Write a protein that binds this ligand. Structure first.
Ligand SMILES: COc1cc([C@@H]2c3cc4c(cc3[C@@H](O[C@@H]3O[C@@H]5CO[C@@H](C)O[C@H]5[C@H](O)[C@H]3O)[C@H]3COC(=O)[C@H]23)OCO4)cc(OC)c1O
Ligand SMILES: COc1cc([C@@H]2c3cc4c(cc3[C@@H](O[C@@H]3O[C@@H]5CO[C@@H](C)O[C@H]5[C@H](O)[C@H]3O)[C@H]3COC(=O)[C@H]23)OCO4)cc(OC)c1O
Ligand SMILES: [Mg+2]
Ligand SMILES: [Mg+2]
Lengths: 775, 775
DNA sequence: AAGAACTCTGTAG
DNA sequence: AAGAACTCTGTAG
DNA sequence: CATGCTACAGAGTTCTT
DNA sequence: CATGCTACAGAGTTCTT
């Protein structure tokens, strides 16, 4: 808070207020205020003020209760959690406003410390839409008359700026779709420099002084419509399902006349802002938080995996977590933050009984934390180190499969793939619990024997249940059972009704009166468990104390209780057909729930009921990916073999060709062309680098004779040429094998999936025997 | 601080306390002390406790005053700064000690909350000797009887561990002298894995389990000698002059019998620890904070420059400060920290009037800070952008000169050069102020006309002062003047006695009574100037108020004073022959003090009196570097020309040689040898990569015929052969030019230094005209 | 009038 | 017997 | 160099009435 | 994602004492 000169004074109704979502915005606004000279309209430290929103603020909609409105008036009670928040009460004190007053007159408006609050956020997809969203939603929920009478204003900054050489006027485009339309209407992207500002601090000194010179412009007054209140309740309200039905549709872009009305006169309706920016943020947060059913993992997590694949390919040597996070932020264009990325890396590399990653993609060296703190006892990322689990990843996410995935394009540059679809569905093996903007994601691990039988029966034709499982595919029968995994769990799973329950085990010695529990349900970390068992009041009347002798990889907890209470828990706590008296006592029963909300590869939410739907949706994607990989391999291999044959023919012909007595490249190429040599680009044949079949053929119909030229002389020896003849023989044999894999009865790549299944389960067993540390 | 159970009770004399230098040691201690079950040693949080020293603490020697000792007893008064320090008073509260009591008897020691305190620091140069040194110096200064009886102990973790395959006992070597003594006494470094632990948190789980299995070992009790107190006064407290005379000698390594006495029975004398670890830290910090007189920049800054040279060589595109800092911490092995590196990068890339870097090595994009806050108002390293100043660096630190520098070896791997000696001495152009462990470094910029004349007269023989300046070299005459720079300074410099003074300029309007100052003394930050003038109580009655309208890269401050006080400052504040009444009143002067303490390339401190000594010491280094560059160029160029002539004549001969009808490499190489061909390694000739003359000749006496083999076939064309013939002609012309540069009269490479001087001054003029922002 | 406190600057923790 | 109350994860400001 | 309030959703104890 | 006490020397400007 930098108080203005005439703040809370006589001229205070003419002042403004700057609301900054970040300290980068704080730095930009400080620079703009310290400009000073040549700005008769650009305000100085006076009449400006300053307030930092502290990142994400909370909405009052889910906090207020609206109780005791039966007295003929609707009174709203602020939450006790809402009252003591620092940012909200800070902006209340700064603006000098009161909740009870309804600012329907000019005098109560003049009571305010500032004349207009002008928020200033980044133009990234969150922020404006989120921070503005919750901010003006809170303002609408408490003081709609401020928004109606023009008290809230947006400081809209350019997102993408394109400069033409010799001209100093920006195009200052504000949306990605507008920039795409301008690029398509333009003939070419020549004599133009394109700059992306994914944050306010990206602006330079000349940039900030140019945009602050016209500070009277680019400030937009918010207006409230009659239909805005319904949108405010829908996007920010207690009823989550009410937004579910409007998070499955998609963002409606603004019409050209609406944008013209916005830019001609700066009156932004709240309904349009909620429908565009807030909805776009909500869709983005759904996509960035809910895992993909093909991946089983978050977009950030798949970005981390792609960065690890690119980083540890050359060398699997040790790397620190902060360095690896910087690497994947630099190379995969992660423009969000650093310590969230480091936290995601740490959680991905964690491995212990009850950890969310049953099959982690990273080998971890350092203190990642055991099951006692649930991964919260992990150390700092600067000294914790991670390396790539080479065998598990190389069997589980094959590079040949990684070529043919769809890829996410960021600013015209390649980034992490759209999805890694693996040989076994990680949406089934992994297990975690996330919230999102409208949905919840919960999964529990299935055993790697039911899923293995299911996939093998679907793929192998020798399994007698292959036809039966295919009939289950067409008719949703689900004959084979799916059971929760028993790995790292000495308890027993039970099924009742439509729910699975996990049970810990206990030993009772009545002559010693110690309740010794050795296995506990597979998610609660045994320390929050003993804190929760220390907060139950009735159990305080029944026990004496709790001692924990549990080390890494094992659990044993001894409970001392009153000698006369040992039977009392029988009468007070109960022993139903599903749980025992002691299981009710120590809360060793745990019902496991599944909320199977996933994001489609297109981008939308798909809901599921059981894991059979997950498996039967994941199976076709691997089907056509194997199918496309096989004929891509066939085409690129026939191109490789014809190019190798051309090399051999030129090698055997150049002795009598005598091309050495030629001047330049054109004459040599003409001679090779009139000798009938095939011109094909060998740099697209030796290394194809994810080229589709039609574009590979259209690239290879033309080509260059550079494979004649770029071949080194050292291959002139006859033994080398015999080795290349043997290589040609092996390439033709591989072509025959690929062709006969294309024509097999069930589907192409039938036995192929068998050896990746065998390799994956062998590597899993190897890592499972040595605490995933391998070596 | 976590309280140990039964600590400060009946068993308090049997306790211990773990003193951790930071959270990195804290994580290892939280792991090792508990370690689950199987804990004979390393008690599971029993009688141990935990305290963090918070990095670096202060020492009590420079805080206490020892006043009023005339009453027959020496009483010591603790400083007000020492009393309210968090860490010291925290450890006082944890140990339950009192300053007044001298713990001679056993009951006073039993009063203590813990039986002993065991320090736990990294084994890095820093921390052991520094943090240990200050901690036990504070203990010695207040309670020597605790150290005498054995209250103070420390745990001595192994710095380097060598593992033999099939054997699970590490060698646990503690010093690098011991480590490379073992390496030289060993036959070979085979069947051995070497692990460096540059910090405690780098130990793994099995490593900390192995160390805590024998926790009763590796704990050493400190003992106080009669000669310890003198060394305590030498290294800490007192005066710099008392330690200067012992920071020029060097560390004395411990004898073998002393180390045997330490390891046989764990009684470490304080004198040996002070003489080895503390002195080694002092020398390291002297080398780390005092700039080299050749470079003008410290070890960290030259590390940053070398990392920038490696990073921006392939592409000079923009990189963030954090990404570049991570790059230089990775590739240049900066094992100290992260944010200090980023701060050093920011200070290196700063450029404004009065900034410490008159010729920065990095061009900047962002808010690095103007002259008003003195660079303290720079933004976060998250978004601030840096790039390499391509022209200035490429003319100023030549890559051909960068090849031949000596290099710092870190763990057998190359790192930043030992010194980046430039074509013009940055120890003269730059200006800054650094304290260190015994010395102070202050410099003031000289103008780029006196130094240009000096260097040109030393180098160019056409300058009539060349012989006179050489006579000044042999006789220390220093005929040519050296003056402080006037760049970015509208004031005037004056010389009185042996000191230069910088003056601000002022305009007086007596009818308007406003003191308008437009330029203040060299390097005074605008803000502080006003805060310090606002603290002077005697000048409060003489002024009314102060206002500042100064924008970036300009100064104008208006002072309003009392109308009757305008003459009063004439009488009370005198106007001497050297200063005006107004200059004395507004403190518009500044005396330019210079403390020319530099570090030698060997490592020692060298002191200077004037900048002529700096110039005359820097000149010979460039002399032999140009000379050795000329021999290296001549040798590698004659090898290149014989290699090129060989390839040309072999292309001409292979038509009738007919080597294609040969089987393998050995037969082909034998045929080439029997035809009289010279085997020389073309990968050592095309790219020499800093090979000295003798080792280059000894590598090139042998070699390989791979240049026959690794040549691509595409060069078979006759126009290519004519191009390589022209290239051979140009190489021979360059050989002739190099040979005639070697034989010129003053020294080899005479006119060479003329064109780098011309290029450097042209690039400097370009930077000056563009505010060091070339684009 | 002499002497104890109090900041500064880079490189560390 | 209903409701307010507080955690609990993985990505983000 | 560890850390600190928040969103979002859904259930499960727990306190509290 | 800003920030907080420290070392080290030496030369100052206020502070009393
Ligand atoms: C003061 O205004 C600002 C606030 C922030 C927040 C922030 C806010 C906090 C706070 C802590 C944080 C902290 O977040 C931490 O990140 C962790 C990483 O993600 C997941 C894994 O877990 C997160 C923690 O839950 C969270 O605590 C900052 C890290 O980067 C951010 O984006 C965070 O504790 C108090 O309020 C950023 C700013 O710069 C734009 C601001 O100007
Ligand atoms: C909580 O974690 C720890 C932090 C620290 C210190 C530290 C200590 C501080 C403090 C701040 C800092 C902070 O930097 C300070 O500011 C300076 C700013 O100019 C740069 C050039 O040099 C920085 C120094 O490094 C340090 O003087 C940390 C940065 O890296 C460190 O190592 C610093 O303010 C209060 O006490 C030590 C630890 O034990 C080993 C820790 O466990
Ligand atoms: Mg942002
Ligand atoms: Mg260290």
């Amino acid at each position: 808070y930098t108080r203005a000169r005439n703040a809370g004074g006589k001229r205070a109704q003419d002042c403004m207020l700057l609301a900054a979502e970040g300290d980068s915005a704080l730095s930009l606004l400080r620079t703009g205020l310290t400009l000073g000279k040549s700005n008769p309209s650009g305000p100085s430290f006076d009449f400006c003020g300053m307030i930092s929103l502290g990142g994400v603020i909370m909405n009052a909609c889910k906090k207020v209760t609206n109780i005791t409105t039966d007295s003929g008036e609707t009174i709203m009670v602020r939450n006790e959690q809402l009252t003591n928040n620092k940012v909200l009460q800070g902006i209340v004190q700064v603006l000098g406003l009161d909740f009870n007053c309804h600012y329907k007159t000019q005098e109560e408006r003049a009571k305010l410390r500032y004349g207009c609050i002008v928020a200033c956020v980044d133009q990234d997809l969150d922020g404006c839409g989120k921070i503005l969203g919750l901010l003006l939603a809170y303002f609408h929920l408490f003081w709609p008359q401020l928004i109606i009478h023009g008290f809230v204003k947006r400081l809209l900054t350019p997102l993408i700026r394109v400069y033409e050489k010799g001209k100093t006027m920006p195009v200052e485009f504000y949306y990605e779709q507008e920039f795409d339309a301008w690029a398509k209407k333009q003939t070419s992207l020549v004599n133009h420099t394109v700059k992306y500002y994914k944050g306010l601090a990206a602006h330079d000194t000349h940039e900030v002084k140019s945009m602050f010179k016209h500070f009277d412009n680019m400030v937009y007054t918010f207006t409230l419509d009659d239909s805005a209140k319904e949108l405010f309740h829908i996007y920010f309200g207690g009823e989550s399902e009410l937004r579910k039905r409007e998070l499955c549709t998609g963002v409606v872009p603004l019409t050209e006349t609406q944008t013209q009305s916005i830019h001609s006169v700066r009156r932004i309706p709240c309904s349009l802002h909620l429908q565009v920016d807030t909805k776009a943020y909500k869709l983005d947060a759904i996509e960035r938080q809910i895992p993909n059913f093909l991946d089983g993992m978050t977009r950030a997590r798949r970005k981390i995996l792609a960065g690890g694949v690119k980083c540890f390919a050359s060398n699997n040597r040790e790397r620190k977590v902060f360095q690896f996070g910087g690497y994947v932020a630099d190379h995969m264009f992660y423009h969000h933050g650093d310590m969230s990325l480091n936290t995601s890396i740490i959680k991905a590399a964690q491995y212990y009984p009850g950890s969310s990653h049953l099959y982690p993609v990273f080998i971890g060296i350092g203190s990642f934390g055991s099951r006692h703190l649930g991964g919260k006892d992990a150390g700092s990322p600067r000294y914790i180190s991670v390396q790539l689990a080479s065998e598990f990843i190389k069997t589980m996410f094959p590079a040949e499969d990684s070529w043919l995935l769809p890829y996410v394009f960021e600013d015209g540059q390649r980034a992490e793939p759209e999805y890694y679809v693996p040989v076994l569905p990680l949406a089934i093996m992994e297990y975690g619990a996330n919230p999102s903007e409208g949905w919840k994601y919960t999964t529990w691990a299935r055993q790697l024997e039911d899923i293995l039988a299911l996939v093998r029966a679907y793929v192998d034709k020798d399994n007698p249940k292959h036809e039966l499982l295919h009939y289950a595919i067409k008719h949703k029968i689900t004959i084979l059972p799916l059971r929760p995994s028993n790995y790292n769990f000495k308890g027993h799973l039970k099924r009742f009704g439509q729910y699975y329950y996990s049970y810990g085990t206990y030993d009772i010695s009545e002559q010693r009166n110690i309740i010794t529990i050795t296995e506990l349900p597979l998610r609660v970390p045994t320390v929050a468990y003993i804190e929760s068992i220390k907060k139950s009041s009735n159990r305080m009347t029944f026990i004496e104390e709790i001692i924990d002798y549990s080390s890494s990889e094992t659990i044993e907890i001894l409970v001392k209780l009153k000698p006369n209470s040992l039977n009392r828990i029988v009468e007070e706590f109960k022993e139903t057909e599903e749980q025992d008296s002691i299981e009710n006592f120590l809360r060793l029963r745990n019902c496991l729930h599944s909320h199977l909300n996933f994001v489609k590869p297109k981008g939308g939410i798909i809901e599921f009921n059981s894991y059979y739907e997950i498996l039967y949706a994941w199976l076709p994607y691997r089907r056509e990916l194997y199918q496309k990989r096989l004929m891509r391999e066939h085409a690129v291999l026939k191109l490789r073999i014809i190019m190798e044959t051309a090399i051999v023919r030129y090698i055997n012909e150049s002795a009598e060709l005598n091309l050495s007595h030629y001047e330049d490249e054109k004459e040599a190429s003409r001679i090779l062309s009139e000798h009938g040599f095939p011109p094909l680009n060998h740099t697209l044949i030796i290394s194809p680098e994810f080229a589709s079949i039609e574009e590979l053929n259209q690239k290879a119909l033309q080509g260059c004779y550079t494979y004649i030229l770029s071949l080194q002389a050292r291959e002139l020896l006859i033994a080398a040429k015999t080795r290349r003849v043997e290589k040609i023989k092996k390439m033709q044999a591989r072509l025959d094998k690929v062709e006969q894999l294309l024509q097999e009865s069930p589907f192409p790549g039938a036995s192929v999936w068998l050896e990746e299944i065998d390799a994956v389960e062998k590597a899993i067993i190897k890592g499972r025997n040595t605490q995933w540390k391998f070596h």
